[PDB]
């Protein structure tokens, strides 16, 4: 079981390049390829990738073709160039999971038994990470009865080596705004978090509307998870919670007030020094 997948920026940019070139060729919607990488005791590391021929019928979810001979040849060449990287999984730029993904994963499992799928949205109309990691798992039900092969989410993050970090930072002269202070602690979170939460709740609302009207059938597991969520929603009118909240807020504001007092004294010191300097300069000039 994978606990985390680390996708390096070179993999993402290579995926973008593959998508762009196949699109320039034309008549395609999703791109597929291999993810070479390495293992670090349940913390994956995807470092490199290469393109692979792939086509699918836009109507039938059973007419798809992946050139495994080309996959093997290119893997041999990549191994000849860098031995420490071995096949770890496959990637596809499709915005969301397709129905052929389990079949493609079964094909790739003959090259990597613990294959990990990474979906890279090259046109992200959202506010969040661009990578979603999935691992194929057998699901046993209680009423759904037949055990199907379903895709299970795995935490994905972006990391980089020193050279990759240097290159990305050099290339990031598009819009650079570090402001690590309260400004960034207000934009990168708070606003972004609330917007993402609203997006997720809107997705849940859309699904619930579809279910209630009758476009989609009922999923007991989804309904159960929603019940658990609504149960977890806390209550903030309890006297004990209110009192604890006020106590902690008072402590934080004590510290804030002391910091502001220090700031004011420093400002006064600077003003006195500046006035001394200006008076001395005027006296000397006179």
């Amino acid at each position: 079981a994978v606990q985390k997948v680390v996708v390096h920026p070179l993999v993402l940019l290579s995926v973008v390049d593959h998508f762009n070139r196949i699109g320039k060729v034309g008549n395609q919607k999703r791109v597929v390829g291999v993810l070479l990488g390495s293992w670090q005791k349940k913390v994956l590391d995807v470092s490199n990738s290469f393109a692979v021929p792939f086509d699918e019928d836009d109507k039938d979810d059973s007419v798809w073709f992946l050139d495994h001979d080309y996959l093997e040849n290119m893997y041999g060449m990549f191994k000849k160039v860098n031995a420490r990287e071995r096949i770890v999984g496959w990637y596809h730029t499709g915005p969301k999971l397709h129905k052929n993904d389990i079949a493609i994963n079964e094909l790739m499992k003959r090259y990597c038994p613990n294959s990990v799928l990474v979906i890279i949205d090259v046109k992200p109309k959202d506010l969040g990470l661009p990578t979603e990691a999935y691992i194929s798992v057998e699901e046993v039900h209680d009423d759904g009865t037949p055990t199907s092969k379903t895709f299970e989410h795995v935490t994905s993050e972006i990391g980089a080596e020193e050279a990759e970090e240097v290159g990305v930072e050099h290339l990031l002269r598009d819009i650079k705004d570090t402001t690590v202070g309260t400004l960034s602690q207000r934009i990168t979170n708070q606003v972004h978090g609330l917007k993402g939460l609203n997006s997720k709740l809107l997705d849940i609302r859309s699904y619930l509307e579809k279910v209630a009207t009758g476009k989609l059938p009922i999923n007991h597991q989804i309904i159960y998870q929603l019940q658990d969520v609504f149960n977890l929603l806390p209550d903030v009118s309890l006297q004990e919670f209110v009192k604890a909240f006020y106590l902690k807020t008072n402590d934080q504001m004590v510290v804030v007030y002391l910091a502001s007092l220090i700031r004011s004294v420093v400002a006064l010191h600077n003003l006195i020094n500046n006035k001394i300097a200006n008076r001395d300069a005027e006296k000397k000039e006179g």
Binding site: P124, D174, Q190, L194, F245, T249, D251, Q252, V255, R263
Partner: protein
């Protein structure tokens, strides 16, 4: 640090100038010593990007939404605040000591006065900034969660 090169034949000027674009780099002394503008010439490197490349580069550093709203253990937060205030106490003592100076100091001696010795004013400012940021962020996150989650 990257550059692009091409050679010069055994001839005159290697290239023709129809703009100022070429003469904007100030070739480095090391390259000039090792043969720049004599056996080879440089070419400007440009980093034109497409929309998807730009978007992916910008999105690389974006964090998960839940990380933004996630709070921070209150025991650890209070411990950090306590530690920094205790440090600020000694820094204030040293600041009082230092303020009494700066009048018995040569105009040149002041600069070298802060060489190998702590600067209470600078450290107090840094601690104030860190404390303000942390506490303001925590309070605002707490209130936002209080409303959002029922």
């Amino acid at each position: 640090v990257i550059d692009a090169f091409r050679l010069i034949n055994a001839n005159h000027e290697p290239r023709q100038t129809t703009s100022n674009l070429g003469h904007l780099n100030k070739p480095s002394i090391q390259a000039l010593i090792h043969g720049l503008n004599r056996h080879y010439y440089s070419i400007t490197i440009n980093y034109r990007k497409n929309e998807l490349e730009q978007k992916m580069l910008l999105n690389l550093h974006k964090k998960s939404w839940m990380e933004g709203l996630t709070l921070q253990d209150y025991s650890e937060h209070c411990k950090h605040n306590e530690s920094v205030v205790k440090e600020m106490l000694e820094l204030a003592k040293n600041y009082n000591k230092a303020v009494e100076e700066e009048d018995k100091m040569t105009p040149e001696q002041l600069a070298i006065k802060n060489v190998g010795k702590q600067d209470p004013k600078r450290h107090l400012e840094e601690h104030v900034d860190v404390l303000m940021t942390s506490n303001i962020v925590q309070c605002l996150a707490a209130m936002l969660d209080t409303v959002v989650f029922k």
